[PDB]
Amino acid sequence: EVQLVESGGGLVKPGGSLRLSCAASGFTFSDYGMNWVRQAPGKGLEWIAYISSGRGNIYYADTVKGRFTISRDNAKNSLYLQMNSLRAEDTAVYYCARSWGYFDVWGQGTTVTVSSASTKGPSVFPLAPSGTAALGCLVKDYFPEPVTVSWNSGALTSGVHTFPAVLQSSGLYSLSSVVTVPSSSLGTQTYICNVNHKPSNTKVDKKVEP
Amino acid sequence: DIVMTQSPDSLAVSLGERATINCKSSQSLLNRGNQKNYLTWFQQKPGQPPKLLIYWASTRESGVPDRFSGSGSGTDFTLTISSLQAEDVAVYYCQNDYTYPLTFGQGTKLEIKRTVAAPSVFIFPPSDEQLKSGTASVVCLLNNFYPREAKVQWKVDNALQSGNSQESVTEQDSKDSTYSLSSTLTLSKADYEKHKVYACEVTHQGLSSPVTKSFNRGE
């Protein structure tokens, strides 16, 4: 089976550097042109770098030329992106993509955040319920993105709404996750939101009681 | 650059009906040496890489249902999605594959058009745990409404609030094609404890007049 897997993304300060990697399997890597394509939060796709198979022709988007360099190691079925002189506008999910006149294989992406702000884990607060009731968890003041939220370790999915994170004026993110339930379920069920903030290695389970 | 321009920027189409997304290039995409128009269409859902739908302007990728169809030539291209299904809600992109730099259209958001549905509204006071730390977040939840347009206003002791709230909206629900929305009012703890009535006022096409949910601090 054909697979592409990016790694190396993380938080880095403006002016800093970072190397991304992409490992490939399930096809003859050396026979294909390979690419990096990125997507800033809430924006469209932007192709940024290419390296061909035989001649290794190299093309860059002007936005990264002179700062980013693409390379490949066919013995390791690997593609690299060396990113120097990073700017806030380089914040994005970075995808590895195979091409044959069009991008036909994509990785899941690796996320790069360029900011001077420090990593901070969230505080988790209950949204307590008052024939429909609502309850939830407020996940406040974290950096950088992302946080993930599940309910009852993934067993509760129906009626859940986990909202997109919002950037506060403080430069920290916040989001809420809610669920609607029949009001009679409040006495027969336990509600626990499981919050994970990997950039800070924070894991919290908060029980939500009326 | 070859500049790629999609039309419309967003589109709402009823289940089972036909969706049409247009893409115009600022220059020809026709390869004179193999006669292919190097125009490519992608579908992208949140949290996922884009999925290849059509390449060479009209060739369907393997596994793509035949209800997806690409057409056009020169500088004018069209993606058609017949018999729209809920799984087709996504952002669609066209892309120049002809010459570098490879350029994308700005994307077109396709949603399901369904009947009007008024929200259920809920209000949450801040937790005692949060209050202790110096901050008060008041949350107003709008549940399972359509269309997305809604006005949510905060009133504190009956005075309209400005500048101290932020909203977030979910993607269309897979089962009923509705949206949900949260509005969060943020005050300091000292400020929060100076007021009594906290109200969220919701205006929406599904509601005959605005709906208010409120609580009295300490009650």
Author numbering:
A (entry chain H): 1 to 130, 137 to 216
B (entry chain L): 1 to 219
The paper states:
CD40 is a 48 kDa type I transmembrane protein that is expressed on a wide range of hematopoietic (B cells, monocytes/macrophages, dendritic cells) and non-hematopoietic (activated epithelium, endothelium) cells. Engagement of CD40 by CD40L expressed on T cells results in the production of proinflammatory cytokines, induces T helper cell function, and promotes macrophage activation. Disruption of this signaling pathway has the potential to reduce production of proinflammatory cytokines, reduce T helper cell function, and inhibit macrophage activation, making it a very attractive therapeutic target for patients with chronic inflammatory disease. Therefore, we determined the crystal structures of ABBV-323 (antagonist) Fab alone and ABBV-323 and FAB516 (agonist) Fabs complexed to the 3 extracellular domains of human CD40 along with in vitro functional assays to better understand the protein interactions that govern agonist and antagonist activity of CD40 mAbs.
A crystal structure of ABBV-323 Fab was solved to 1.74 Å resolution and the ABBV-323 Fab/CD40 complex structure was solved to 2.84 Å resolution. The structure of ABBV-323 Fab alone illustrates two loops (HCDR2 and LCDR1) which create a cleft of approximately 25 Å with a diversity of charge. When comparing the complex structure with the Fab alone structure, there is a backbone shift in HCDR2 that allows opening of the cleft to accommodate CD40 binding. Mutation data supports this structural observation: a HCDR2 S56G residue change results in 20-fold improvement in binding affinity due to higher flexibility introduced by a glycine at this position. This flexibility most likely aids Fab cleft opening and facilitates a hydrogen bond interaction of (H)R55 with CD40.
